[PDB]
Design a protein around this ligand. Structure first.
Ligand SMILES: CSc1ccncc1CC(=O)N1CCC[C@H](C(N)=O)C1
Ligand SMILES: [Zn+2]
Length: 139
């Protein structure tokens, strides 16, 4: 679990969005596993606007942060799950690191701000949904 709180927006994994997220929907994209909902309170986070390929992510299944080198956002095949059929997930970045299903939502940050959130994983890999291209989050 986990979310990014920026301005009057809450960014979550689309597969973990609540009834309230859907009732206050701003934008969602099944191909990216992202959903953004509106909030009444002003958020705590800054979004990176950069091309970093190194950063640190929070891994809830270890209660620890780990440094990672990750690939640029791209279209990556993701196996079928209870949430989605087998498909290509876009804007996904992979890295070697521990993750388990419940780790989705963990933030990936570089020196410039929030890069994205944990969205996929398996066998010593971890995938992050990028949010750096969503320029409207800052306005
Ligand atoms: C950190 S998720 C994870 C980690 C390790 N083994 C498995 C997983 C689960 C996982 O990859 N997905 C299930 C939930 C929806 C995901 C998606 N974006 O399509 C895919
Ligand atoms: Zn950066």
């Amino acid at each position: 679990s986990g979310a990014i709180y920026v301005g009057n927006y809450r960014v979550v994994n689309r597969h973990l969005a609540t009834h309230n997220d859907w009732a206050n929907l701003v934008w969602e994209d099944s191909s990216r596993d992202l959903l953004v909902s509106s909030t009444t309170a002003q958020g705590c986070d800054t979004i990176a606007r950069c091309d970093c390929q190194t950063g640190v992510y929070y891994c809830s299944s270890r209660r620890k942060h780990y440094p990672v080198s990750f690939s640029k956002p791209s279209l990556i095949f993701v196996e079928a799950s209870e949430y989605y059929p087998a498909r290509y997930q876009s804007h996904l970045m992979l890295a070697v690191g521990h993750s388990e299903p419940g780790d989705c939502g963990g933030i990936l940050r570089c020196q410039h701000g929030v890069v994205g959130i944990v969205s996929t994983g398996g066998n010593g890999l971890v995938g992050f949904a990028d949010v750096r291209d969503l320029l409207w989050l800052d306005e």
